[PDB]
Design a protein around this nucleic acid. Sequence first.
DNA 1: TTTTTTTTTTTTTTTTTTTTTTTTTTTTTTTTTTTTTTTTTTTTTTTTTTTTTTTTTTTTTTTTTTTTTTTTTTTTTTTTTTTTTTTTTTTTTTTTTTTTTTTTTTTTTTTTTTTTTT
DNA 2: AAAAAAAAAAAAAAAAAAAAAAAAAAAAAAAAAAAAAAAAAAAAAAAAAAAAAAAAAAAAAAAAAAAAAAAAAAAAAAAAAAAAAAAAAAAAAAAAAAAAAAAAAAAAAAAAAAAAAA
Length: 49
Amino acid sequence: RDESDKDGMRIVIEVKRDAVGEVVLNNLYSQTQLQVSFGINMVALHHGQ
DNA sequence: TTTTTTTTTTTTTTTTTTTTTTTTTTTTTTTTTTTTTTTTTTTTTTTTTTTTTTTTTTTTTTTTTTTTTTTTTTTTTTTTTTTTTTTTTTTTTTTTTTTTTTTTTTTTTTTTTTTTTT
DNA sequence: AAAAAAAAAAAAAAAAAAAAAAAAAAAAAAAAAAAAAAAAAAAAAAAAAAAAAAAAAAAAAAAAAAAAAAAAAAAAAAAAAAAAAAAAAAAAAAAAAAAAAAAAAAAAAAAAAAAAAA
């Protein structure tokens, strides 16, 4: 569910009874877009080049 | 002035191909039906002192049939080879980010004309 | 000849989509190491076999830990209410083979035309 009540976002992911929750969260970080890689590439025009 | 040769698009309608309407089979999806978990209380089950008469282990000795035993020849075990499956590098493809180039649609409102049905 | 529906005029309401360019991630499909599994060789520990043996069940009998009886008291589990999880039953569906209608090529032959001969 999503419960974003304009008081900060709130995505509720209820975990099943036969699960640890931390393992589910680690799997979500590994697989889903809860963790992303930001590739820095600092290119800018210096003296018009 | 009359008469002669040639050229193509039409009378074309039929053969071939394409396009457009169709409906059998394996993959989704909503329903009922059966596995799970938490409370009340409830007679009911079950934990823990005391006494008691019991029935199996430890003095001692006996034997016999399972523990000794050696040896032949099997046959499971191991070796090499090859096939089948599993699993991971490799490659390919696709999506999102932010400024650019391009486009495309659905309805109100009135009045008049085409364009089908009865 | 009556009814009905499309379409077009111009100011209004409101939407949708395709690509380029680089760099990173995520699916998804392949070669290729790598180890189970299986067929077919020789090979070698185990059962057989036999004689020979001595270690633990019987038997006598005391006695000492015991399982039933009695009592008090604690409170686990069972059945009845509700409330969720998860799987077969049945029905539906999108591509997909089958059929039918329209576009392009085909030549047989002639109307009209253009051109030229004597």
